[PDB]
Amino acid sequence: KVYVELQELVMDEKNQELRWMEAARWVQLEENLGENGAWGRPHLSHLTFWSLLELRRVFTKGTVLLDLQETSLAGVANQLLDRFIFEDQIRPQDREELLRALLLKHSHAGELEALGGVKPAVLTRSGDPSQPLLPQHSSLETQLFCEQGDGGTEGHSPSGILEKIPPDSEATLVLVGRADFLEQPVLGFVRLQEAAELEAVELPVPIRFLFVLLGPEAPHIDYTQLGRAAATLMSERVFRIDAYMAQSRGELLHSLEGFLDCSLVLPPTDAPSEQALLSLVPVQRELLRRRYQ
Amino acid sequence: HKVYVELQELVMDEKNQELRWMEAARWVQLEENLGENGAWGRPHLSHLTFWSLLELRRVFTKGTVLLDLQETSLAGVANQLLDRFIFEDQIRPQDREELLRALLLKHSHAGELEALGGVKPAVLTRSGDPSQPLLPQHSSLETQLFCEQGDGGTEGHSPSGILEKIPPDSEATLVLVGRADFLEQPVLGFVRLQEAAELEAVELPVPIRFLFVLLGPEAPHIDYTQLGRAAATLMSERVFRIDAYMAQSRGELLHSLEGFLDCSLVLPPTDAPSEQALLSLVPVQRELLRRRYQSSPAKPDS
Asked: Where found (chain A)?
């Protein structure tokens, strides 16, 4: 298994500043950070058809930095930005504002409670946040798994997920942020030359990979879901290993392809939920077998 | 009511080597697949591949739609459809002759399968001749984990049981899928008859109300069988069916497809222990179902 963390550029409800805040985490299974700094119960990562379409889109044209010889976020950021600009992924004048934002405080659950929650925000050409124009709303994950404050069976069952992170594993950080001056969604993927522990992550697991998903507020794209797909992709072994072994973007893309090719889609059905989802078992079992070819 | 859908494919019978359409699967909410032996497999929930859906969406968006078409024969539908394809630039004037004859080839069913010994994957040649696909063929997942039951064991003709669920006043849908390596791109034709007319092409005399004609060249990321399954599965979904009957343009059909996709749950590859499945595979399934029926006058029926 592996530990993956998802953080989003947000505006804190209190001071109204602009920080990064943890939204979900994986250790195979996924957990969602509630509005009150309380973790949602673990669950299987289901993804929207859209997030996989977009991920495939944005990755096929992604900026890839393999064996980046950096051990800091500032070091990675400066580098990722130089490649972005270079690949015409972003404009030269966006750099100063994007670096500054990427280097903000990367808050975690424990701070959420003190800050009095956090709000959705959009980075501007001045560095000031701005509420997104297009209508905002709590995700399915929050609506479904975030109605606790304390786990029903046990107020700390969610913490039990952390009990599954392997003795010698590495982590992945997925950063999701919106900037109004950006012309389109961009995907940045980095593999550190040597695993480095970053102060941006919740727990001290050495970081090996980073996904940076940035873009302007566009009507047909949900960045939280794009993030969840990226993280869920990294949480899959066959991919994770291809990610360790790839020597170019194409090898990663070829792997994303198998992941997609082995994903199962269960359209809207009125059939009895348990049987409806117990039906996937024999099918999934085969696709799972095909992935491991 | 629960529309009976049948999916047929342009195929080549092993013995005679002739071309013809052979029934591949049928739906009455649940899906069954025709085993290579002419034997129906168990009815199951339709699970679709991400690619069959992306392709269905791409083709539906540029789809040739004929609503309330005043025709009562497959041939009558074919001529109109082909004339519409050409006008909308889905096919060339030179491709009509070959595509019409093809659409009008024999439409065989399971019983015929046994008699023919079997059929083999085919591609329509520019000269109307059958040809083996260029890309290496393979057994579909459905034919693998469902079909091989046809022998009559502790349940004789149990899959027939699905036929028991066809409503007393239901209309059907025909999904025809075929590869013509001379077409320049895949194309989708969607037809809604002014009046449901029964057609010999269908296994059962249920009045055909809709048709999906998906034709094209062998292209990457495009399994025509799976694309067929996606269209037939879309039709079998209550909210889309009701939109398909109300639609007065392609837009309404596409809006419904959007909703179908929004409410679809993609379950990525991973080690499958039932306990770990249900957690999302229950409350999430419920939410997507609830969202799907939110604006539709339909009602979920287990």
From this structure: Cell membrane; Basolateral cell membrane
